[PDB]
Design a protein around this ligand. Sequence first.
Ligand code: PEB
Ligand code: PEB
Ligand code: PEB
Ligand code: PEB
Ligand code: CYC
Ligand code: CYC
Ligand code: CYC
Ligand code: CYC
Ligand code: CYC
Ligand code: CYC
Ligand code: CYC
Lengths: 44, 172, 172, 172, 96, 162, 162, 162, 162, 231
Amino acid sequence: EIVPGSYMYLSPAEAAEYRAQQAAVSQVSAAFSADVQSKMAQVS
Amino acid sequence: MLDAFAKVVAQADARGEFLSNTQIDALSKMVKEGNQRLDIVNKVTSNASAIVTNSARALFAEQPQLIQPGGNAYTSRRMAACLRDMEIVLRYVSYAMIAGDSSVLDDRCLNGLRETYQALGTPGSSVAVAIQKMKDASVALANDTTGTPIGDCSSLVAELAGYFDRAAVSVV
Amino acid sequence: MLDAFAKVVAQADARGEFLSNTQIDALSKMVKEGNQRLDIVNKVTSNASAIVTNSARALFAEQPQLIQPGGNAYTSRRMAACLRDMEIVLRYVSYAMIAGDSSVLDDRCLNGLRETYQALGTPGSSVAVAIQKMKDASVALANDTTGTPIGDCSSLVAELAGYFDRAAVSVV
Amino acid sequence: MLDAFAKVVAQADARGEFLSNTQIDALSKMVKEGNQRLDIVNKVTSNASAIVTNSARALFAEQPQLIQPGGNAYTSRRMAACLRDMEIVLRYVSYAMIAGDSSVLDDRCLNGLRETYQALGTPGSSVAVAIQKMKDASVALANDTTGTPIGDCSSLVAELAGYFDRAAVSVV
Amino acid sequence: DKARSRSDWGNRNVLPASEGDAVLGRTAKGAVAVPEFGIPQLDDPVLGFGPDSMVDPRIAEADGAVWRWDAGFVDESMTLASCADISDEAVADEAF
Amino acid sequence: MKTPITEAIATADNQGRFLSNTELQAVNGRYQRATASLTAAKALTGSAQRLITGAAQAVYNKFPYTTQMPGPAYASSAIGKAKCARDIGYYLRMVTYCLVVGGTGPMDEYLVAGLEEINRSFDLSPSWYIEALQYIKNSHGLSGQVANEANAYIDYAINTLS
Amino acid sequence: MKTPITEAIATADNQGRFLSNTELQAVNGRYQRATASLTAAKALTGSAQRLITGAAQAVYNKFPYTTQMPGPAYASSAIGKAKCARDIGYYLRMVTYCLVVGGTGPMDEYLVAGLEEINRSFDLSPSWYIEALQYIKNSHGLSGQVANEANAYIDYAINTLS
Amino acid sequence: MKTPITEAIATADNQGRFLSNTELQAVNGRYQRATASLTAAKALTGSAQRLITGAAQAVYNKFPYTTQMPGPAYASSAIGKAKCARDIGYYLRMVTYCLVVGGTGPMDEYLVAGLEEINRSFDLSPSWYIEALQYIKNSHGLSGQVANEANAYIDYAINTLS
Amino acid sequence: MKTPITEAIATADNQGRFLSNTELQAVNGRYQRATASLTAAKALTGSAQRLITGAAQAVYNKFPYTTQMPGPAYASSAIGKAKCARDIGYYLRMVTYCLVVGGTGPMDEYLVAGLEEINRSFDLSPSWYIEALQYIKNSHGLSGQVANEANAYIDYAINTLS
Amino acid sequence: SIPILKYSLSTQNQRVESFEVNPGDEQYRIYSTDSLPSSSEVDQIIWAAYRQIFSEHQILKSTKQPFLESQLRFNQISIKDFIKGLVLSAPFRDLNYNVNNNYRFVEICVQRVLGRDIYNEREKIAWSIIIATQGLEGFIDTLLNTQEYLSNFGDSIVPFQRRRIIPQRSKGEMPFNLKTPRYGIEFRSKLAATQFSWASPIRRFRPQEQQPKAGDPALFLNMVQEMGPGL
Ligand SMILES: C=CC1=C(C)[C@@H](Cc2[nH]c(/C=C3N=C(/C=C4\NC(=O)[C@H](C)[C@H]4CC)C(C)=C\3CCC(=O)O)c(CCC(=O)O)c2C)NC1=O
Ligand SMILES: C=CC1=C(C)[C@@H](Cc2[nH]c(/C=C3N=C(/C=C4\NC(=O)[C@H](C)[C@H]4CC)C(C)=C\3CCC(=O)O)c(CCC(=O)O)c2C)NC1=O
Ligand SMILES: C=CC1=C(C)[C@@H](Cc2[nH]c(/C=C3N=C(/C=C4\NC(=O)[C@H](C)[C@H]4CC)C(C)=C\3CCC(=O)O)c(CCC(=O)O)c2C)NC1=O
Ligand SMILES: C=CC1=C(C)[C@@H](Cc2[nH]c(/C=C3N=C(/C=C4\NC(=O)[C@H](C)[C@H]4CC)C(C)=C\3CCC(=O)O)c(CCC(=O)O)c2C)NC1=O
Ligand SMILES: CCC1=C(C)/C(=C/C2=NC(=C\c3[nH]c(/C=C4\NC(=O)[C@H](C)[C@H]4CC)c(C)c3CCC(=O)O)/C(CCC(=O)O)=C2C)NC1=O
Ligand SMILES: CCC1=C(C)/C(=C/C2=NC(=C\c3[nH]c(/C=C4\NC(=O)[C@H](C)[C@H]4CC)c(C)c3CCC(=O)O)/C(CCC(=O)O)=C2C)NC1=O
Ligand SMILES: CCC1=C(C)/C(=C/C2=NC(=C\c3[nH]c(/C=C4\NC(=O)[C@H](C)[C@H]4CC)c(C)c3CCC(=O)O)/C(CCC(=O)O)=C2C)NC1=O
Ligand SMILES: CCC1=C(C)/C(=C/C2=NC(=C\c3[nH]c(/C=C4\NC(=O)[C@H](C)[C@H]4CC)c(C)c3CCC(=O)O)/C(CCC(=O)O)=C2C)NC1=O
Ligand SMILES: CCC1=C(C)/C(=C/C2=NC(=C\c3[nH]c(/C=C4\NC(=O)[C@H](C)[C@H]4CC)c(C)c3CCC(=O)O)/C(CCC(=O)O)=C2C)NC1=O
Ligand SMILES: CCC1=C(C)/C(=C/C2=NC(=C\c3[nH]c(/C=C4\NC(=O)[C@H](C)[C@H]4CC)c(C)c3CCC(=O)O)/C(CCC(=O)O)=C2C)NC1=O
Ligand SMILES: CCC1=C(C)/C(=C/C2=NC(=C\c3[nH]c(/C=C4\NC(=O)[C@H](C)[C@H]4CC)c(C)c3CCC(=O)O)/C(CCC(=O)O)=C2C)NC1=O
């Protein structure tokens, strides 16, 4: 289940490849969370 | 299409008779019921968008398989037709209320509707559930004494509920 | 089309106005004439074939060239189409009488009639004599008191004869 | 449309007259030479394809600017439309030959045709050359003595020549 | 003669030419006479029927003054609006 | 049939509309005038035999050749006299059907549609039936708005024959 | 008009065809019926006023109320008698028009279109004009195929009047 | 116009007919209702500016974001409050036009036709105008058949927006 | 088909009419022309063994490439020669049907309908069939109106091929 | 195979939307057999189709097609076949097709079958050769099988003059029977039993059209018929 009306029917091998590629974008939203510490005086 | 006054005339011509005084005095009782009948029809036509929308929203609450992906109400073009089909039936029931008999509900709405829904794959039993949810939404509104003289009109709400049962058994 | 109550609404809106109490009081003077206006169109409708054929009989007695061989109302298909024209004009003057103004007469009947008769070779000045003979057959019928309560409808007689005048100057 | 017999009737009805004895006798003279009238449209119809395609071939030999680029008969669609215009006009001349008068030729074929060619940009003088090239081609066939008893048809052939001539002055 | 009968409305006289000649009670067409002006809603310069709020096109067909046979129909093919402004210098020098 | 109720539904179904106040006021005008027209249909029904035999005799005084001329079209035999009083009863019955319904709907369906091919084929004259209907208009004995309702449907039948 | 010449053009015209041998036989059949058809049209033309005044008198003998009953529809006036004999001259002139063209062209266009509408408006019985045409059918004095052609169009006007 | 008068002329003219009693009863039902329907229009007009400035304030109470949020579609400026009370008075003026005409004529031509295309383009939410009409439906102060006429056109406007 | 008997019925059937005198003269023009038609049909039937194999050789003498050029469209084989003689027998048999019926009815529905698509697809030229048809018109050996009727249907087949 | 020639469109009302939910009194009364009408209401479909194709002046008894009517009452033909059967009828060929040329007959049948005016003059020129080469039976089939007919009317609706009045207005376009009569300025001259082409208004020594003036006692005549009661 992606949304409650939109779904993904994937094989049990390739369903690991869907989940371990959006945990591969969950390590760059841990890196743009340091865009809040430099809100003022960024590139000086 | 016929009303209730021309229903009793089409039956007297087929035997070549004048109307007797009992059939005349039964027709003038229908005339003095006439202001109470126009109150019921006014009470439905002024709440018509809320009869349709609430009884639709109460239908996809208890039947979520209709709007789940793959259902017969998914993909808003089919959702727009389910709301049209509810509005059509409530329109032609209120037409048969001012008439007094369901000759306009029968031919130009209900003749061929079980046949149409079976051709498309519409679940005709779910349509009967939605029609019976606009019945008790408008029986409850015709029993509301807001802005009317308090008299008795219980015989015309039992008539209006019968036109909703007529349309609900005609699609299953 | 417009009736007489819709003509005041279109003037008022064109300037974005409400209706004053002086304007409402002049519209309830139009309602109080309501039953005398309905008697006048009832007397014209109920005698509508004697208005047309008595005034066509009068039209050919004093203009006998129209029904001679080579005339325009010769050859009974053109005689029947001639009486059709008089029933048509009498129909729309009857429409303009309950409406209270002549806008349904103006664009559904008279619009393009003068130019139609020139393309057919029909004498449009003799059609105006045909309308003028139905004018006083209808006025003498509306001044006639049979079947009516006592009272007054004399400003309405002058109004009915003004729609017959409008129809007769639009064709010459 | 009218033939030669109904032309006399429609003129007599506009005067309110019976036909005179010299009008019946002029009509029965048409019946006496009726077999020779049918032999003329038998020769013209049986060679109607060769009248069109031989006179069209001779029109572009002597008018070579019609089929040069930019000319009115230059494309596949504009050239095949030139061939069917000749076959329409040749068809409505033979309709005027068995009828006896040029009432089907004028109403069905030649009415409003000069103004149509002016709107299309078709050179109307060259259409008259093509009609005149079909005139003498079918007169030469009408004077053929093969398969007929020898007699005088010279007043009938001079009538067929007048139908092509009327078509040629009604198109420029 | 002067319209005296209600019986001669169909016989002799036609209808009042001007609206000052109307029947006792009504307009020239014959409908009831109602005052033209009601209460204006939204008195306001930018949003409201100001002096230069352009005319309704439906004010004439509602009048019945667009149809040529009715008396309200004025034809402007011969009025001063259809005459060329001579103060325009393109028109004077050409017509000199 | 064309009734005031089925002509308000048909103009609202043509517009894809619920029953507005335009249509509720029209049905209410039927219910107001139905008191005067239901007593006209009750008073014409109860005095029907006086009106049929009277109106057939009014044709015989006015057109007395219809009782003397031989042939199947005329009221000269006893068979052809009962077929006349049959037809007067047909016209009077349709007038009462239009008074209870409101609007010229029953006689538009049962009587006037195809009537001219009947009168042409069997050589019946529509002026015999106008004279019969002009008797019933003058002899029904109604008054007020009760006579106004009855005479409005007598005159509809005359206008289809005239 | 409906004429065997013009009904032959109008079958090749509806398909865009030249006149084949199908339509030249139809014109030929008109040309070998026209001899007996044109002598009837001038034998009735010369015998007109004998047949007009006798046929109007034959209506007045069968229906003598038409000379007695007052009103505009009847020939009880000097004006109404002039309009009666005008009408018999219309019907007789259309029969001679149909014989000189072949087939019921002129009387379809000039007489029978709209005939039922004006009979009902002006209160004219079509049984009057049938009796006037039964006089002409018996009293034209023609024989042979000249009587067959004449009675073919008298019977056509009788069939569409009744 | 959806007057009961112009709806009667239209049903007669659909079939090329004179106005029978089917159509005169629809006109008569307009006149019986025009008494209560004209005292409602007089009382709504006299309390126009009280109801307009009251209903504008009820929208700013239920939807307070409409006075704060920047942008052209909101009543967050002095021009946006002038155009908001312009629109309340538009809906009120069309209701009073329907009361002096009888039936939902002026509201369909001047207000409802094209409303859905306008409210999508200029980002005007139709829930604001429903709240404004529910205020007038509760605060006009009328009773009896005069409020019954008034509320039938407030409710007709709410069903078009809903 | 398109007999003058069936084109007179279908004329009167499209007008809802009995057979008037316009149609009976079209039938009698078929009966006058019939004895010159039924003798040409009888004469071409017995003389068909000469007129087919005589006309097949008339094509091979004007267009000798149709016997030498290889391919399926030409008569350079015994299959193509026997199908070429079959084609001339279709044209002659259709003429004797049009003589028996009278008029170009049978060869319109059996032969000329859809023929331009057949010649264009199977690459076979219509100028081969014209030279065969001009042979039969030159060598059928009749005279009078027996030849003038027979040549009227050979010339119809040539005018559809060009 | 000679396609039809190309013509240009023009701005018309029906090419563009009216945003009209809830139409009014100028909505033009769909007559359909999809509403299952009874015998009294199928008479109204037949009269509406006669009025649309013929005039009101050609609904005579000698014009009506009684056998085409009975095949519509038995559900054998559709309304598109009734409309085709009226155009190919013998009264329509006699009263309308024989007194027009090929260009004015196209604009009659465009206005009455398609329910719209012609786009330009070249559209009359483009369609008048369908008549001359295939007949009326081929012209009415290629006109009823356009997408303009099958989208608007389908096969079970009587045609009407599409979009004649604009929703605000009181004066709309001219009705198509008053705009285009049976015959025009040609065929008027002497081919339709006509003289002199115009006429002055009828003169008389009793004037009959005197306008009332401001002191005339018929303008005050109002309550002259009867005095009001009370005290
Ligand atoms: C223009 C549109 C139009 C209308 C809306 C009605 C409105 C209306 N209703 C009533 C009058 C009435 N209306 C009703 C009907 C009802 N009352 C109730 O308590 C129930 C809730 C409901 C019926 C289910 C009753 C019952 C009376 C009579 C009072 C009584 O005896 O209880 C009257 C007074 C006339 C009479 O007494 O009959 C009027 C004008 N008439 C119209 O012309
Ligand atoms: C069903 C359709 C229908 C009608 C036909 C009319 C019929 C009609 N007219 C009147 C009532 C009336 N009708 C007339 C009219 C006339 N009297 C005359 O002397 C003149 C000759 C004539 C006018 C030209 C008058 C004067 C009154 C009553 C007086 C008044 O209302 O002031 C009334 C009674 C109203 C009342 O009692 O006040 C009715 C029902 N109304 C309808 O609903
Ligand atoms: C239905 C089919 C049909 C036709 C196609 C025509 C053709 C035709 N014409 C004539 C008959 C005739 N045809 C002609 C015609 C001519 N003589 C000439 O020298 C000119 C070349 C030519 C005129 C242009 C003449 C003059 C007669 C009269 C016979 C004669 O004079 O001996 C005949 C024989 C009848 C008779 O002998 O009178 C036929 C069949 N008629 C028909 O019925
Ligand atoms: C199936 C039906 C059928 C028939 C009845 C015959 C009829 C017949 N015979 C011949 C043709 C002929 N018919 C005869 C016959 C005769 N000549 C004489 O001198 C004798 C008196 C008589 C024989 C008893 C001759 C000699 C020929 C010409 C030679 C031939 O064609 O074989 C022709 C062609 C010529 C024409 O008529 O146009 C026909 C149709 N053939 C048939 O196919
Ligand atoms: C005579 C008047 C009239 C009636 C009675 C009528 C019924 C009708 N309803 C239809 C469809 C429909 N009806 C529905 C309704 C529903 N489906 C559900 O699951 C719910 C239970 C219910 C809504 C509450 C749906 C979803 C369709 C679309 C079916 C489809 O197109 O696949 C269709 C098919 C055409 C279309 O797709 O819109 C017709 C003809 N049409 C008419 O003109
Ligand atoms: C609903 C509005 C409306 C009107 C008003 C109208 C008029 C109208 N009258 C017509 C014809 C006609 N009008 C007349 C009328 C007359 N001739 C006379 O000599 C007399 C003076 C006069 C009347 C007594 C005649 C004789 C014709 C027949 C023309 C013909 O076809 O020859 C025609 C020609 C179309 C046809 O006949 O098929 C139209 C359009 N049509 C409409 O749709
Ligand atoms: C009333 C009976 C009737 C006639 C006779 C008639 C003729 C007619 N000829 C036309 C075109 C035409 N006609 C021609 C014919 C010619 N141009 C030349 O250069 C030659 C001189 C001549 C051939 C001999 C051409 C070239 C066109 C236009 C083709 C095009 O523009 O594509 C058109 C325009 C239709 C189209 O574009 O195909 C009509 C309607 N229409 C009718 O309804
Ligand atoms: C409900 C609608 C309806 C009507 C209107 C109707 C009329 C009607 N009247 C008829 C006959 C008749 N009608 C009359 C009546 C009259 N002749 C006279 O001389 C008198 C003056 C006049 C009486 C007032 C006669 C004598 C016949 C018999 C004609 C015949 O048998 O040839 C017939 C022939 C069949 C029959 O009844 O025997 C019909 C169908 N039928 C209907 O179903
Ligand atoms: C050419 C086609 C054609 C026909 C058929 C035709 C019939 C015709 N006959 C008429 C009148 C008339 N016809 C008659 C005839 C008769 N009444 C009797 O009592 C006699 C028995 C009978 C004579 C047979 C009378 C008296 C009138 C005058 C009716 C009236 O003025 O109201 C009228 C009324 C106008 C007039 O002529 O004054 C028409 C149109 N007109 C035509 O143009
Ligand atoms: C006679 C029928 C009629 C109606 C109903 C109508 C509505 C209407 N309201 C509009 C704008 C507007 N309407 C509002 C009103 C509001 N916004 C808010 O936040 C408030 C909550 C609410 C007031 C209740 C505003 C602020 C605009 C300007 C929007 C813009 O210009 O983009 C516009 C855009 C043009 C303009 O007036 O500036 C139209 C057409 N016009 C009409 O002619
Ligand atoms: C009853 C109406 C009718 C007609 C008119 C008709 C024509 C016809 N001729 C054909 C072939 C043929 N036609 C020919 C004839 C000729 N080629 C030559 O070289 C000669 C000059 C000429 C003979 C005179 C040949 C050789 C073929 C064979 C072509 C092929 O099969 O590819 C074919 C293809 C099928 C076949 O017969 O094998 C048709 C359909 N068929 C019909 O049913």
